[PDB]
Design a protein around this ligand. Structure first.
Ligand SMILES: O=C(N[C@@H](CO)C(=O)O)c1cccc(O)c1O
Ligand SMILES: O=C(O)c1cccc(O)c1O
Ligand SMILES: O=C(O)c1cccc(O)c1O
Ligand SMILES: [Fe+3]
Length: 174
């Protein structure tokens, strides 16, 4: 067995209006992370990592996440392909990811120069996962934006223990 909080219907996940793909480019720090498989591991807490979005000439994003683990910097790469509407994407070259049958990204909201919330839903080995990240253009964000992200995650069925705030580090994300 594996038990998961159901994914919310897309009807409850807002889409940022007039999404500007070019302003969304660059480096974003994950200051908040919530999902049905996200768990506040109370001893060794999650280290902040970052995600860089660069618009390709064809307008798909090359997405690079960088995290600090086992004393090195690991680079996780993937392609986000414009989906049904602006601000929505699907994963490119899905065939190359074993077990992956579905992957959707939806930019919930953002002001481009400070913060963003982004929703992800993917089906892996037939399991439906979903997560929300609170991106900060810097490593810190006000308590107002953070609780608002907690509010939004709860509205999607998540409990406090499935919501974390990665502690800021300087390695690999600076
Ligand atoms: O739950 C997710 N990931 C966790 C478990 O596979 C994790 O620990 O990264 C998850 C959910 C939706 C979309 C994703 O890219 C994703 O990594
Ligand atoms: O698998 C990862 O390391 C990862 C990192 C950042 C964002 C993601 O969705 C990931 O799956
Ligand atoms: O981004 C991916 O390609 C991916 C593949 C498998 C599992 C994941 O979480 C991913 O984010
Ligand atoms: Fe992932």
């Amino acid at each position: 067995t594996s038990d998961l909080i159901p994914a919310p219907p897309l009807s409850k996940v807002p889409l940022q209006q007039n999404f500007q793909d070019n302003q969304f480019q660059g480096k974003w720090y994950v200051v908040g992370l919530a999902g049905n498989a996200i768990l506040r591991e109370d001893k060794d807490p999650q280290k902040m990592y970052a995600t860089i979005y660069e618009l390709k000439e064809d307008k798909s994003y090359n997405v690079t996440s960088v995290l600090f683990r086992k004393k090195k910097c690991d680079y996780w790469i993937r392609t986000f392909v414009p989906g049904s509407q602006p601000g929505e994407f699907t994963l490119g070259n899905i065939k190359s990811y074993p077990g992956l049958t579905s992957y959707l990204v939806r930019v919930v909201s953002t002001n481009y120069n400070q913060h963003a919330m982004v929703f992800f839903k993917k089906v892996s080995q037939n399991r439906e996962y979903f997560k929300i990240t609170l991106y900060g253009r810097t490593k810190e964000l006000t308590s107002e934006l953070k609780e608002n992200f907690i509010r939004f995650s709860k509205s999607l069925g998540l409990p406090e223990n499935h919501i974390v705030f990665p502690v800021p580090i300087d390695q690999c994300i600076d």
